């Protein structure tokens, strides 16, 4: 489509099926939150087009706003460009940067790291989840998401990583999100209630299959 923005994401083109990339997920959630129209183009990681090597080093997400626009990679560049070009609806965030900053790396080091550092990585992960949980609790009058009642830039970045964390850790390690992280559990329920989240939910098997590719 030359009519709306194209978002190249990880998918199965032969089945028109979105897959599990959390950074693609972040861009997609950003577009849904601003109710901007888009069209998904699925990249099969076992058969990537040669031009994607030049545009992004082989990576997704990539967007393409039209025939005269260039390809633009990096979910960070994309969401900031998004906020500059479309200030309404806003996705700007008061949340400090340090929060959730090591959720995904610690969770990954748990899944696919050396055993000797696993105990430490578990500890660090739980500090991250503690930070997010406390933050959502102190702001729960504004709403259950980092953006109160609606999706935030922090929601768009952190909710996919948390999704991968709970699903993959429960499947591969029997690990579970403690019941004391109340605000995290109602955060997950709130996200699962959102139509923006429902539109681009790839599902838990997509996550499992994505990570089985490395364990």
């Amino acid at each position: 489509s030359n009519i709306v923005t194209t978002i190249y994401v990880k998918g199965d083109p032969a089945k028109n099926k979105l897959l599990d990339c959390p950074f693609c997920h972040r861009v997609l959630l950003a577009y849904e939150a601003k109710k901007l129209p888009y069209k998904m183009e699925y990249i099969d990681f076992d058969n990537k087009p040669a031009w994607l090597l030049e545009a992004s080093g082989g990576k997704v997400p990539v967007i393409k706003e039209g025939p005269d626009a260039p390809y633009m990679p990096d979910s960070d560049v994309i969401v900031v460009h998004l906020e500059k070009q479309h200030p309404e609806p806003s996705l700007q965030s008061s949340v400090p940067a340090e929060i959730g900053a090591k959720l995904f790396p610690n969770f990954r080091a748990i899944l696919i790291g050396p055993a000797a550092e696993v105990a430490d990585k578990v500890a660090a992960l739980e500090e991250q989840l503690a930070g997010m949980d406390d933050y959502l609790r102190q702001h729960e009058a504004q709403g259950p998401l980092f953006g109160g009642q609606h999706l935030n830039g922090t929601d768009c970045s952190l909710a996919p990583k948390l999704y991968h964390a709970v699903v993959a850790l429960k499947h591969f390690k029997g690990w579970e999100l403690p019941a004391r992280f109340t605000a995290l559990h109602k955060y997950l329920a709130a996200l699962k209630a959102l139509p923006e989240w429902q539109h681009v939910d790839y599902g838990t098997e997509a996550i499992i299959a994505g990570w089985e590719r490395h364990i």
Side-chain angles (χ1 to χ4, degrees), residues 95-124:
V95 185
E98 71 178 55
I99 294 172
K102 321 178 197 170
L103 169 64
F104 180 83
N106 293 330
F107 147 66
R108 174 183 61 189
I110 291 168
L111 276 191
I112 64 182
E117 54 160 52
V118 153
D120 294 343
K121 287 305 186 305
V122 172

Side-chain angles (χ1 to χ4, degrees), residues 36-174:
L36 291 161
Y38 61 90
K39 206 236 159 207
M40 285 160 73
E41 211 75 60
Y42 301 115
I43 304 288
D44 167 21
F45 277 0
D46 296 287
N47 208 85
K48 298 186 271 209
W51 64 262
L52 186 74
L53 181 73
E54 169 57 49
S56 72
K59 300 307 192 302
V60 294
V62 181
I63 73 147
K64 185 72 152 63
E65 310 194 88
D68 313 274
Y71 292 109
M72 177 169 82
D74 195 340
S75 72
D76 224 315
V77 180
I78 289 163
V79 297
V80 173
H81 165 100
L82 183 63
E83 202 77 28
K84 187 184 176 192
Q85 300 307 123
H86 311 268
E88 230 63 53
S90 176
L91 307 185
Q92 300 193 281
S93 198
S94 318
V95 185
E98 71 178 55
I99 294 172
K102 321 178 197 170
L103 169 64
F104 180 83
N106 293 330
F107 147 66
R108 174 183 61 189
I110 291 168
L111 276 191
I112 64 182
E117 54 160 52
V118 153
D120 294 343
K121 287 305 186 305
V122 172
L125 175 67
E126 200 219 68
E127 168 167 49
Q128 298 284 315
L129 295 177
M132 300 166 59
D133 172 71
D134 295 346
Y135 192 95
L136 291 180
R137 188 173 299 107
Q138 283 207 305
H139 294 75
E140 68 178 288
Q142 318 187 332
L145 316 176
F146 290 98
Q149 285 287 325
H150 323 281
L151 284 188
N152 195 34
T154 291
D155 289 319
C156 294
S157 175
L158 284 187
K161 306 184 187 183
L162 180 68
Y163 194 21
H164 280 243
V166 302
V167 169
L169 284 183
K170 169 62 171 58
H171 175 269
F172 291 108
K173 294 283 204 272

Side-chain angles (χ1 to χ4, degrees), residues 164-211:
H164 280 243
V166 302
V167 169
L169 284 183
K170 169 62 171 58
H171 175 269
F172 291 108
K173 294 283 204 272
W175 182 94
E176 231 153 66
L177 191 66
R180 66 174 211 268
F181 291 143
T182 43
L184 288 193
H185 291 275
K186 32 189 67 188
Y187 182 63
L188 281 150
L191 288 164
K192 304 212 257 202
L194 268 172
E196 291 92 307
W197 177 274
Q198 292 175 359
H199 292 354
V200 292
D201 191 339
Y202 34 83
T204 71
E205 319 71 63
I207 306 175
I208 302 315
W211 282 101

